[PDB]
């Protein structure tokens, strides 16, 4: 059996700390249901991100394969920062299958893709959410040339601008073994979390993703075990 099943599997096989476990189970739990056991676990993840580091100003969230729960982690972890009084920007950096816009119920007409090429403005592309201190930069329209936008100069410089006025930036991404989008993001965003599907995963896949992220220069803060 190739599956990574727990904190011990994680430490031995990946040499990273488990920063939080989310149980299996209407999606923004930290907001909609602040009293749930699952919400507290997200606040625990925020706590462990703080112990893991220096302080975390930019965070990339990724996984080895689709469906791991990247997006759910991004959304909820971002909310725990906002409610703690930090100015927080979620960037939906998944321009292949954008999803933050559905999660927060915001319109994805302008977003990252069109911001990068300059077809929209910062004020236009960034939307304030219903959660105080939490802004959302949706993915924008799905571009033909994602790799090219991510590796661009406007992106690196937009991140720098954003980080002048946001305490923390949390960036959702496409799976690592699927496309190289996350590795490219690692140029502008050094710190990262790896989200693992506890019920369904391959030890070797997760190692490859970790190696790929480490090769792109990413500081992997730790792992989130999901659907445990
Ligand atoms: N802890 C969990 N328990 C149950 N379902 C989950 C959990 N985390 C994510 N999901 C579900 O799994 C699906 C994929 O999650 P998502 O975060 O969108 O995947 P991705 O890793 O591709 O971003 C979603 O429909 C979501 O509701
Ligand atoms: Mg997703």
Numbering used by the authors: 197 to 221, 1009 to 1036, 1039 to 1213
Provide passages from the article that reported this PDB entry.
A new family of protein tyrosine-kinases harboring a P-loop type nucleotide binding-domain with a Walker A motif has been described. They have been called BY-kinases (Bacterial-tyrosine-kinases) as they are only found in bacterial genomes. BY-kinase autophosphorylation on a C-terminal tyrosine cluster, called Y-cluster is crucial in regulating polysaccharide export. In firmicutes, the situation is quite similar except that BY-kinases are split into two proteins: one corresponds to the cytoplasmic catalytic domain of proteobacterial BY-kinases (about 230 residues) and the other is a transmembrane domain homologous to the Wzz-like domain (about 230 residues) of proteobacterial BY-kinases.
To test this and further understand why CapB1 is less active than CapB2, we solved the crystal structure of the CapA1B1 chimera. Clear electron density corresponding to a bound ADP molecule and associated Mg2+ ion was observed in the active site of CapA1B1. The stacking interaction between the CapA1 Phe221 and the base part of the bound ADP is conserved. Phe221 is stabilized in this position by a T-shaped hydrophobic interaction with CapB1 residue Phe12 replacing the stacking interaction with CapB2 residue Ile12 observed in the CapA1B2 structure. Surprisingly, despite the inactivity of the protein, the CapA1B1 structure does not display the expected octameric conformation and the Y-cluster is disordered. This suggests that CapB1 is intrinsically in the monomeric active conformation compatible with the binding of specific protein substrate. The basic isoelectric point of CapB1, with a calculated value of 8.8 (compared with 5.45 for CapB2), suggests that the formation of a CapB1 oligomer compatible with trans-autophosphorylation could be impaired by unfavorable electrostatic surface charges. Altogether, this data prove that CapB1 does not possess a tyrosine-kinase activity despite its BY-kinase signature and a 3D structure very similar to that of the active BY-kinase CapB2.
